[PDB]
mmCIF file of N, CA, C and O in Angstrom:
data_model
loop_
_atom_site.group_PDB
_atom_site.id
_atom_site.type_symbol
_atom_site.label_atom_id
_atom_site.label_comp_id
_atom_site.label_asym_id
_atom_site.label_seq_id
_atom_site.Cartn_x
_atom_site.Cartn_y
_atom_site.Cartn_z
ATOM 1 N N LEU A 1 -46.567 -29.049 2.636
ATOM 2 C CA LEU A 1 -45.183 -29.591 2.713
ATOM 3 C C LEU A 1 -44.376 -28.744 1.833
ATOM 4 O O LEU A 1 -43.214 -28.385 1.859
ATOM 5 N N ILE A 2 -45.067 -28.623 0.511
ATOM 6 C CA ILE A 2 -44.114 -28.112 -0.604
ATOM 7 C C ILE A 2 -44.050 -26.593 -0.381
ATOM 8 O O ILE A 2 -43.207 -26.002 -0.538
ATOM 9 N N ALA A 3 -44.972 -25.805 0.402
ATOM 10 C CA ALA A 3 -44.956 -24.442 0.601
ATOM 11 C C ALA A 3 -43.931 -24.286 1.671
ATOM 12 O O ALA A 3 -43.120 -23.380 1.524
ATOM 13 N N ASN A 4 -43.741 -25.234 2.656
ATOM 14 C CA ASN A 4 -43.023 -25.102 3.932
ATOM 15 C C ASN A 4 -41.280 -25.392 3.187
ATOM 16 O O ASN A 4 -40.462 -24.780 3.541
ATOM 17 N N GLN A 5 -41.295 -26.532 2.071
ATOM 18 C CA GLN A 5 -39.992 -26.405 1.442
ATOM 19 C C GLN A 5 -39.663 -25.469 0.770
ATOM 20 O O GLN A 5 -38.435 -24.945 0.877
ATOM 21 N N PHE A 6 -40.424 -24.732 0.182
ATOM 22 C CA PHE A 6 -40.151 -23.675 -0.680
ATOM 23 C C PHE A 6 -39.794 -22.463 0.113
ATOM 24 O O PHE A 6 -38.630 -21.647 0.035
ATOM 25 N N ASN A 7 -40.295 -22.327 1.362
ATOM 26 C CA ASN A 7 -40.172 -21.014 2.162
ATOM 27 C C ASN A 7 -38.814 -21.409 3.006
ATOM 28 O O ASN A 7 -37.956 -20.552 3.011
ATOM 29 N N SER A 8 -38.333 -22.567 3.199
ATOM 30 C CA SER A 8 -37.345 -22.931 3.854
ATOM 31 C C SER A 8 -35.877 -22.836 2.845
ATOM 32 O O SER A 8 -34.995 -22.358 2.829
ATOM 33 N N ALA A 9 -36.269 -23.208 1.494
ATOM 34 C CA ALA A 9 -35.397 -23.186 0.623
ATOM 35 C C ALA A 9 -34.879 -21.881 0.229
ATOM 36 O O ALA A 9 -33.841 -21.419 0.286
ATOM 37 N N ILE A 10 -35.875 -20.718 0.463
ATOM 38 C CA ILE A 10 -35.645 -19.363 0.287
ATOM 39 C C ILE A 10 -34.940 -18.914 1.473
ATOM 40 O O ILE A 10 -33.849 -18.029 1.181
ATOM 41 N N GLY A 11 -35.242 -19.165 2.491
ATOM 42 C CA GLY A 11 -34.461 -19.010 3.783
ATOM 43 C C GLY A 11 -32.913 -19.180 3.695
ATOM 44 O O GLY A 11 -32.178 -18.583 4.227
ATOM 45 N N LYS A 12 -32.779 -20.498 3.231
ATOM 46 C CA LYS A 12 -31.309 -21.029 2.852
ATOM 47 C C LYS A 12 -30.524 -20.293 2.025
ATOM 48 O O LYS A 12 -29.586 -20.112 2.195
ATOM 49 N N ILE A 13 -31.520 -19.874 0.784
ATOM 50 C CA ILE A 13 -30.796 -19.217 -0.024
ATOM 51 C C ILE A 13 -30.361 -17.875 0.520
ATOM 52 O O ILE A 13 -29.108 -17.177 0.228
ATOM 53 N N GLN A 14 -31.221 -17.158 1.389
ATOM 54 C CA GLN A 14 -30.781 -15.969 2.034
ATOM 55 C C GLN A 14 -29.333 -16.081 3.049
ATOM 56 O O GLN A 14 -28.531 -15.250 2.880
ATOM 57 N N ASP A 15 -29.546 -17.134 3.581
ATOM 58 C CA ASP A 15 -28.572 -17.498 4.821
ATOM 59 C C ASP A 15 -27.314 -17.759 3.783
ATOM 60 O O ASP A 15 -26.097 -17.135 4.247
ATOM 61 N N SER A 16 -27.178 -18.520 2.912
ATOM 62 C CA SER A 16 -26.022 -18.835 1.857
ATOM 63 C C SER A 16 -25.489 -17.700 1.212
ATOM 64 O O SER A 16 -24.102 -17.382 1.265
ATOM 65 N N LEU A 17 -26.346 -16.633 0.563
ATOM 66 C CA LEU A 17 -25.955 -15.461 0.321
ATOM 67 C C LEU A 17 -25.099 -14.528 1.208
ATOM 68 O O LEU A 17 -24.064 -14.251 1.010
ATOM 69 N N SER A 18 -25.617 -14.462 2.447
ATOM 70 C CA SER A 18 -25.065 -13.719 3.619
ATOM 71 C C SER A 18 -23.694 -14.265 4.027
ATOM 72 O O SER A 18 -22.636 -13.652 4.109
ATOM 73 N N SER A 19 -23.775 -15.618 4.123
ATOM 74 C CA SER A 19 -22.429 -16.310 4.894
ATOM 75 C C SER A 19 -21.351 -16.550 3.737
ATOM 76 O O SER A 19 -20.274 -15.984 3.927
ATOM 77 N N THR A 20 -21.709 -16.761 2.523
ATOM 78 C CA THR A 20 -20.638 -16.920 1.615
ATOM 79 C C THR A 20 -20.439 -15.773 0.869
ATOM 80 O O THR A 20 -21.116 -15.280 0.043
ATOM 81 N N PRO A 21 -19.154 -15.204 0.853
ATOM 82 C CA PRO A 21 -18.813 -13.797 0.403
ATOM 83 C C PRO A 21 -18.788 -14.127 -1.390
ATOM 84 O O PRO A 21 -19.114 -13.406 -2.080
ATOM 85 N N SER A 22 -18.516 -15.253 -1.890
ATOM 86 C CA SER A 22 -18.377 -15.503 -3.336
ATOM 87 C C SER A 22 -19.623 -16.147 -3.733
ATOM 88 O O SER A 22 -19.713 -16.645 -4.722
ATOM 89 N N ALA A 23 -20.947 -15.833 -3.094
ATOM 90 C CA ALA A 23 -22.160 -16.343 -3.731
ATOM 91 C C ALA A 23 -22.445 -15.486 -5.118
ATOM 92 O O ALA A 23 -22.852 -16.057 -5.882
ATOM 93 N N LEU A 24 -22.007 -14.417 -5.031
ATOM 94 C CA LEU A 24 -22.396 -13.424 -6.237
ATOM 95 C C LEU A 24 -20.713 -13.437 -6.850
ATOM 96 O O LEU A 24 -20.467 -12.221 -7.423
ATOM 97 N N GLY A 25 -20.386 -14.425 -7.188
ATOM 98 C CA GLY A 25 -19.025 -14.485 -7.838
ATOM 99 C C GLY A 25 -19.071 -14.352 -9.147
ATOM 100 O O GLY A 25 -18.286 -13.460 -9.625
ATOM 101 N N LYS A 26 -20.051 -14.256 -10.057
ATOM 102 C CA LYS A 26 -20.085 -13.865 -11.508
ATOM 103 C C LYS A 26 -20.267 -12.301 -11.572
ATOM 104 O O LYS A 26 -19.553 -11.840 -12.304
ATOM 105 N N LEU A 27 -21.163 -11.806 -10.820
ATOM 106 C CA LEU A 27 -21.318 -10.331 -10.902
ATOM 107 C C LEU A 27 -20.073 -9.771 -10.062
ATOM 108 O O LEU A 27 -19.620 -8.709 -10.934
ATOM 109 N N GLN A 28 -19.532 -9.995 -9.341
ATOM 110 C CA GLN A 28 -18.176 -9.582 -8.614
ATOM 111 C C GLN A 28 -16.990 -9.830 -9.727
ATOM 112 O O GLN A 28 -16.283 -8.861 -9.684
ATOM 113 N N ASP A 29 -17.058 -10.902 -10.195
ATOM 114 C CA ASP A 29 -15.886 -10.834 -11.250
ATOM 115 C C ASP A 29 -16.360 -10.017 -12.423
ATOM 116 O O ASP A 29 -15.226 -9.526 -12.928
ATOM 117 N N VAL A 30 -17.379 -9.683 -12.975
ATOM 118 C CA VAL A 30 -17.507 -8.924 -14.322
ATOM 119 C C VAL A 30 -17.133 -7.409 -13.626
ATOM 120 O O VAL A 30 -16.481 -6.644 -14.185
ATOM 121 N N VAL A 31 -17.611 -6.806 -12.238
ATOM 122 C CA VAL A 31 -17.318 -5.965 -11.819
ATOM 123 C C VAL A 31 -15.893 -5.424 -11.577
ATOM 124 O O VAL A 31 -15.290 -4.490 -12.035
ATOM 125 N N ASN A 32 -15.137 -6.764 -11.216
ATOM 126 C CA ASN A 32 -13.821 -6.836 -11.005
ATOM 127 C C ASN A 32 -13.036 -6.579 -12.233
ATOM 128 O O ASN A 32 -11.936 -5.885 -12.651
ATOM 129 N N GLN A 33 -13.398 -7.246 -13.162
ATOM 130 C CA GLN A 33 -12.802 -7.032 -14.752
ATOM 131 C C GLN A 33 -12.996 -5.537 -15.336
ATOM 132 O O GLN A 33 -12.026 -5.254 -15.748
ATOM 133 N N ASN A 34 -13.981 -5.307 -15.066
ATOM 134 C CA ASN A 34 -14.236 -3.693 -15.662
ATOM 135 C C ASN A 34 -13.411 -2.737 -14.644
ATOM 136 O O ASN A 34 -12.620 -1.838 -15.481
ATOM 137 N N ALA A 35 -13.238 -2.880 -13.523
ATOM 138 C CA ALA A 35 -12.495 -2.193 -12.712
ATOM 139 C C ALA A 35 -11.098 -2.294 -13.075
ATOM 140 O O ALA A 35 -10.234 -1.288 -13.037
ATOM 141 N N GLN A 36 -10.666 -3.421 -13.065
ATOM 142 C CA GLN A 36 -8.993 -3.805 -13.636
ATOM 143 C C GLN A 36 -8.787 -2.976 -14.803
ATOM 144 O O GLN A 36 -7.676 -2.511 -15.139
ATOM 145 N N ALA A 37 -9.861 -3.274 -15.880
ATOM 146 C CA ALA A 37 -9.537 -2.671 -17.165
ATOM 147 C C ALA A 37 -9.544 -1.319 -16.980
ATOM 148 O O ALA A 37 -8.496 -0.664 -17.690
ATOM 149 N N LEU A 38 -10.269 -0.587 -16.097
ATOM 150 C CA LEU A 38 -10.188 0.862 -16.093
ATOM 151 C C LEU A 38 -9.229 1.344 -15.508
ATOM 152 O O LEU A 38 -8.497 2.424 -15.754
ATOM 153 N N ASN A 39 -8.730 0.709 -14.393
ATOM 154 C CA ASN A 39 -7.620 0.879 -13.639
ATOM 155 C C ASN A 39 -6.240 0.651 -14.611
ATOM 156 O O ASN A 39 -5.300 1.801 -14.501
ATOM 157 N N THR A 40 -6.226 -0.067 -15.332
ATOM 158 C CA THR A 40 -5.209 -0.588 -16.204
ATOM 159 C C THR A 40 -5.033 0.811 -17.330
ATOM 160 O O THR A 40 -3.933 1.338 -17.438
ATOM 161 N N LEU A 41 -5.966 1.056 -17.755
ATOM 162 C CA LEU A 41 -6.328 2.288 -18.649
ATOM 163 C C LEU A 41 -5.630 3.409 -18.044
ATOM 164 O O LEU A 41 -5.157 4.165 -18.829
ATOM 165 N N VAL A 42 -6.157 3.646 -17.019
ATOM 166 C CA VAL A 42 -5.876 4.878 -16.299
ATOM 167 C C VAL A 42 -4.312 4.895 -15.954
ATOM 168 O O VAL A 42 -3.431 5.811 -16.028
ATOM 169 N N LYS A 43 -3.669 3.788 -15.407
ATOM 170 C CA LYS A 43 -2.025 3.908 -15.277
ATOM 171 C C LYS A 43 -1.590 3.709 -16.446
ATOM 172 O O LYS A 43 -0.203 4.325 -16.402
ATOM 173 N N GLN A 44 -1.772 3.275 -17.768
ATOM 174 C CA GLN A 44 -1.125 3.613 -18.870
ATOM 175 C C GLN A 44 -0.928 5.199 -18.914
ATOM 176 O O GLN A 44 0.176 5.567 -19.712
ATOM 177 N N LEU A 45 -1.533 6.003 -18.360
ATOM 178 C CA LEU A 45 -1.271 7.247 -18.591
ATOM 179 C C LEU A 45 -0.015 7.763 -17.612
ATOM 180 O O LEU A 45 0.620 8.822 -17.911
ATOM 181 N N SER A 46 0.522 6.869 -16.760
ATOM 182 C CA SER A 46 1.752 7.174 -15.962
ATOM 183 C C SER A 46 2.913 6.562 -16.787
ATOM 184 O O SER A 46 3.870 6.562 -16.341
ATOM 185 N N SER A 47 2.626 5.633 -17.840
ATOM 186 C CA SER A 47 3.729 4.950 -18.554
ATOM 187 C C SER A 47 4.225 5.926 -19.646
ATOM 188 O O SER A 47 3.519 6.769 -20.126
ATOM 189 N N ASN A 48 5.472 5.874 -19.775
ATOM 190 C CA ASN A 48 6.265 6.837 -20.541
ATOM 191 C C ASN A 48 5.913 6.596 -22.188
ATOM 192 O O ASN A 48 5.967 7.374 -23.022
ATOM 193 N N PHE A 49 5.884 5.138 -22.363
ATOM 194 C CA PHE A 49 5.728 4.899 -23.867
ATOM 195 C C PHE A 49 7.031 5.134 -24.713
ATOM 196 O O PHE A 49 7.221 5.486 -25.952
ATOM 197 N N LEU B 1 -3.286 33.643 -4.745
ATOM 198 C CA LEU B 1 -3.891 32.586 -4.777
ATOM 199 C C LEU B 1 -5.202 32.539 -4.841
ATOM 200 O O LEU B 1 -6.073 33.267 -4.257
ATOM 201 N N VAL B 2 -5.980 31.832 -5.652
ATOM 202 C CA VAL B 2 -7.642 31.595 -6.238
ATOM 203 C C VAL B 2 -8.228 30.107 -5.664
ATOM 204 O O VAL B 2 -7.602 29.179 -6.135
ATOM 205 N N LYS B 3 -9.122 30.189 -4.938
ATOM 206 C CA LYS B 3 -9.770 28.935 -4.348
ATOM 207 C C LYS B 3 -11.178 29.037 -5.087
ATOM 208 O O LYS B 3 -11.759 29.959 -5.053
ATOM 209 N N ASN B 4 -11.805 27.627 -4.929
ATOM 210 C CA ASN B 4 -13.106 27.452 -5.393
ATOM 211 C C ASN B 4 -13.424 28.110 -6.724
ATOM 212 O O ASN B 4 -14.656 28.064 -7.237
ATOM 213 N N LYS B 5 -12.386 28.420 -7.693
ATOM 214 C CA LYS B 5 -12.747 28.909 -8.666
ATOM 215 C C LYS B 5 -12.025 28.097 -10.088
ATOM 216 O O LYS B 5 -10.627 28.143 -9.697
ATOM 217 N N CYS B 6 -12.580 27.816 -11.115
ATOM 218 C CA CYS B 6 -11.741 27.050 -12.531
ATOM 219 C C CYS B 6 -10.540 28.147 -12.405
ATOM 220 O O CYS B 6 -10.935 29.155 -13.285
ATOM 221 N N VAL B 7 -9.347 27.712 -12.277
ATOM 222 C CA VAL B 7 -8.178 28.803 -12.602
ATOM 223 C C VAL B 7 -6.892 27.935 -13.518
ATOM 224 O O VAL B 7 -6.913 26.522 -13.299
ATOM 225 N N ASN B 8 -6.141 28.598 -14.172
ATOM 226 C CA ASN B 8 -4.916 27.830 -14.673
ATOM 227 C C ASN B 8 -3.663 28.198 -13.420
ATOM 228 O O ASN B 8 -3.241 29.256 -13.324
ATOM 229 N N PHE B 9 -3.109 27.201 -12.996
ATOM 230 C CA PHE B 9 -2.520 27.241 -11.798
ATOM 231 C C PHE B 9 -0.992 26.522 -12.235
ATOM 232 O O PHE B 9 -1.005 25.592 -13.049
ATOM 233 N N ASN B 10 0.241 27.037 -11.863
ATOM 234 C CA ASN B 10 1.297 26.721 -12.080
ATOM 235 C C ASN B 10 2.238 26.739 -10.749
ATOM 236 O O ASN B 10 2.812 27.813 -10.182
ATOM 237 N N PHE B 11 2.007 25.739 -10.129
ATOM 238 C CA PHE B 11 2.696 25.563 -8.549
ATOM 239 C C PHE B 11 4.091 24.939 -8.833
ATOM 240 O O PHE B 11 3.932 23.724 -8.910
ATOM 241 N N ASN B 12 5.030 25.653 -8.904
ATOM 242 C CA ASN B 12 6.540 25.363 -9.305
ATOM 243 C C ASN B 12 6.604 24.537 -10.449
ATOM 244 O O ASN B 12 7.080 23.425 -10.265
ATOM 245 N N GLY B 13 5.669 24.801 -11.305
ATOM 246 C CA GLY B 13 6.005 24.145 -12.893
ATOM 247 C C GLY B 13 5.120 22.897 -13.040
ATOM 248 O O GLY B 13 5.261 22.112 -13.994
ATOM 249 N N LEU B 14 4.057 22.645 -12.054
ATOM 250 C CA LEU B 14 3.175 21.491 -12.656
ATOM 251 C C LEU B 14 2.215 21.892 -13.895
ATOM 252 O O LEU B 14 2.071 21.004 -14.739
ATOM 253 N N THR B 15 2.084 23.362 -14.020
ATOM 254 C CA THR B 15 1.222 23.827 -15.328
ATOM 255 C C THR B 15 0.183 22.938 -15.665
ATOM 256 O O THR B 15 -0.068 22.172 -16.468
ATOM 257 N N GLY B 16 -0.990 23.093 -14.619
ATOM 258 C CA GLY B 16 -2.266 22.606 -14.613
ATOM 259 C C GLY B 16 -3.519 23.316 -14.828
ATOM 260 O O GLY B 16 -3.346 24.450 -14.093
ATOM 261 N N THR B 17 -4.643 22.700 -14.955
ATOM 262 C CA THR B 17 -6.060 23.645 -15.004
ATOM 263 C C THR B 17 -6.702 22.723 -14.199
ATOM 264 O O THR B 17 -6.926 21.409 -14.084
ATOM 265 N N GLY B 18 -7.457 23.320 -13.122
ATOM 266 C CA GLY B 18 -8.352 22.725 -12.128
ATOM 267 C C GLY B 18 -8.930 24.077 -11.401
ATOM 268 O O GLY B 18 -8.167 25.040 -11.232
ATOM 269 N N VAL B 19 -9.893 23.184 -10.511
ATOM 270 C CA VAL B 19 -10.335 24.120 -9.368
ATOM 271 C C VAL B 19 -9.862 23.911 -8.217
ATOM 272 O O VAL B 19 -9.721 22.576 -7.730
ATOM 273 N N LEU B 20 -9.369 24.835 -7.202
ATOM 274 C CA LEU B 20 -8.595 24.637 -6.074
ATOM 275 C C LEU B 20 -9.600 24.655 -4.981
ATOM 276 O O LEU B 20 -10.218 25.625 -4.683
ATOM 277 N N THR B 21 -9.430 23.654 -4.060
ATOM 278 C CA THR B 21 -10.448 23.695 -2.866
ATOM 279 C C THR B 21 -9.580 23.213 -1.597
ATOM 280 O O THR B 21 -8.647 22.495 -1.567
ATOM 281 N N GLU B 22 -9.722 23.833 -0.566
ATOM 282 C CA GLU B 22 -9.193 23.249 0.710
ATOM 283 C C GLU B 22 -9.171 22.147 1.070
ATOM 284 O O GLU B 22 -10.550 21.707 1.137
ATOM 285 N N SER B 23 -8.260 21.373 1.506
ATOM 286 C CA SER B 23 -8.392 19.953 1.831
ATOM 287 C C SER B 23 -7.791 19.783 3.242
ATOM 288 O O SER B 23 -7.121 20.603 4.003
ATOM 289 N N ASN B 24 -8.516 19.034 3.918
ATOM 290 C CA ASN B 24 -8.205 18.310 5.155
ATOM 291 C C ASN B 24 -7.001 17.478 5.397
ATOM 292 O O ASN B 24 -6.590 17.024 6.294
ATOM 293 N N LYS B 25 -6.521 16.842 4.108
ATOM 294 C CA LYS B 25 -5.299 15.932 4.112
ATOM 295 C C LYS B 25 -4.397 16.518 4.563
ATOM 296 O O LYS B 25 -4.004 17.627 4.548
ATOM 297 N N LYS B 26 -3.512 15.940 5.427
ATOM 298 C CA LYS B 26 -2.337 16.334 5.976
ATOM 299 C C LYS B 26 -0.867 15.835 5.623
ATOM 300 O O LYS B 26 -0.774 14.648 5.259
ATOM 301 N N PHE B 27 -0.157 16.754 5.228
ATOM 302 C CA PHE B 27 0.972 16.458 4.326
ATOM 303 C C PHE B 27 2.240 16.512 5.427
ATOM 304 O O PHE B 27 2.183 17.686 6.278
ATOM 305 N N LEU B 28 3.103 15.428 5.673
ATOM 306 C CA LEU B 28 4.267 15.767 6.251
ATOM 307 C C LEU B 28 5.106 16.771 5.609
ATOM 308 O O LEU B 28 5.270 16.946 4.512
ATOM 309 N N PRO B 29 6.114 17.329 6.593
ATOM 310 C CA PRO B 29 6.695 18.620 6.424
ATOM 311 C C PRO B 29 7.853 18.327 5.030
ATOM 312 O O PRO B 29 8.044 19.235 4.279
ATOM 313 N N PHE B 30 8.378 17.122 5.087
ATOM 314 C CA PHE B 30 9.383 17.037 3.980
ATOM 315 C C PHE B 30 8.613 16.686 2.332
ATOM 316 O O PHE B 30 9.032 17.346 1.648
ATOM 317 N N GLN B 31 7.525 16.069 2.289
ATOM 318 C CA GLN B 31 6.701 15.854 1.026
ATOM 319 C C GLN B 31 6.142 17.124 0.804
ATOM 320 O O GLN B 31 5.343 17.736 1.424
ATOM 321 N N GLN B 32 6.017 17.363 -0.501
ATOM 322 C CA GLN B 32 5.407 18.372 -0.913
ATOM 323 C C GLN B 32 3.994 18.291 -1.472
ATOM 324 O O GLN B 32 2.939 18.818 -1.308
ATOM 325 N N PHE B 33 3.771 17.306 -2.502
ATOM 326 C CA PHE B 33 2.520 17.195 -3.016
ATOM 327 C C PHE B 33 2.181 15.926 -3.327
ATOM 328 O O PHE B 33 3.106 14.794 -3.372
ATOM 329 N N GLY B 34 0.930 15.291 -3.364
ATOM 330 C CA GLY B 34 0.373 14.236 -3.540
ATOM 331 C C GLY B 34 0.014 13.719 -4.948
ATOM 332 O O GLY B 34 0.524 14.383 -5.937
ATOM 333 N N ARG B 35 -0.239 12.569 -5.090
ATOM 334 C CA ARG B 35 -0.496 11.856 -6.459
ATOM 335 C C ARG B 35 -1.790 10.764 -6.327
ATOM 336 O O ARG B 35 -2.341 10.495 -5.209
ATOM 337 N N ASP B 36 -2.171 10.203 -7.473
ATOM 338 C CA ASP B 36 -3.546 9.498 -7.457
ATOM 339 C C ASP B 36 -3.016 8.469 -8.512
ATOM 340 O O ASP B 36 -1.788 8.348 -8.680
ATOM 341 N N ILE B 37 -4.065 7.690 -8.770
ATOM 342 C CA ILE B 37 -3.677 6.183 -9.433
ATOM 343 C C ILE B 37 -2.810 6.523 -10.782
ATOM 344 O O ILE B 37 -2.033 6.030 -11.331
ATOM 345 N N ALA B 38 -3.530 7.647 -11.544
ATOM 346 C CA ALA B 38 -2.925 8.088 -12.828
ATOM 347 C C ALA B 38 -1.606 8.875 -12.712
ATOM 348 O O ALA B 38 -1.161 9.213 -13.842
ATOM 349 N N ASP B 39 -0.937 8.989 -11.557
ATOM 350 C CA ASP B 39 0.105 9.585 -11.415
ATOM 351 C C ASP B 39 -0.031 11.137 -11.758
ATOM 352 O O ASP B 39 1.026 11.628 -12.268
ATOM 353 N N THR B 40 -1.052 11.647 -11.664
ATOM 354 C CA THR B 40 -1.388 13.106 -12.025
ATOM 355 C C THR B 40 -1.740 13.772 -10.684
ATOM 356 O O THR B 40 -2.317 13.214 -9.648
ATOM 357 N N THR B 41 -1.249 15.052 -10.558
ATOM 358 C CA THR B 41 -1.346 15.811 -9.036
ATOM 359 C C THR B 41 -2.519 15.892 -8.519
ATOM 360 O O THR B 41 -3.533 16.451 -9.349
ATOM 361 N N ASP B 42 -2.787 15.286 -7.510
ATOM 362 C CA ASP B 42 -4.077 15.439 -6.759
ATOM 363 C C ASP B 42 -4.104 16.374 -5.620
ATOM 364 O O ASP B 42 -5.223 16.808 -5.188
ATOM 365 N N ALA B 43 -2.982 16.867 -5.444
ATOM 366 C CA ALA B 43 -2.898 17.953 -4.202
ATOM 367 C C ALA B 43 -1.857 18.437 -4.094
ATOM 368 O O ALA B 43 -0.496 17.837 -4.269
ATOM 369 N N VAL B 44 -1.409 19.913 -3.912
ATOM 370 C CA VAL B 44 -0.402 20.291 -3.942
ATOM 371 C C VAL B 44 -0.181 21.479 -2.623
ATOM 372 O O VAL B 44 -1.176 21.749 -2.275
ATOM 373 N N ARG B 45 1.110 21.698 -2.104
ATOM 374 C CA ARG B 45 1.243 22.455 -1.048
ATOM 375 C C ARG B 45 1.680 23.622 -1.665
ATOM 376 O O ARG B 45 2.523 23.708 -2.485
ATOM 377 N N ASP B 46 1.366 24.892 -1.380
ATOM 378 C CA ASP B 46 1.687 26.299 -1.843
ATOM 379 C C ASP B 46 3.331 26.696 -1.535
ATOM 380 O O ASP B 46 3.523 25.924 -0.466
ATOM 381 N N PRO B 47 3.723 26.848 -2.250
ATOM 382 C CA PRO B 47 5.338 27.387 -2.111
ATOM 383 C C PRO B 47 5.295 28.465 -1.220
ATOM 384 O O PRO B 47 6.121 28.476 -0.627
ATOM 385 N N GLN B 48 4.578 29.618 -1.512
ATOM 386 C CA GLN B 48 4.607 30.959 -0.701
ATOM 387 C C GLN B 48 4.274 30.787 0.675
ATOM 388 O O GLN B 48 5.147 30.886 1.705
#
């Protein structure tokens, strides 16, 4: 029973990760923050100052 | 005109340094040159 519950739990993790786009929310937020910082830094080259 | 070699290019006063490669991007007749996020020129149409 415990082996079956563990296997079904892993399968449900797989399905939830696949279905929910925001499952990897922390990592995607980190990547987005870094990308936004880099894009802002690049854009400041376009500012006259 | 020099392609595929790092050269100093002055295309109607852009005055930049870089290597020129032929591009498949299509420019409409009115518009001359393209731009990137940094608003630095990423593609130029030859004047001649």
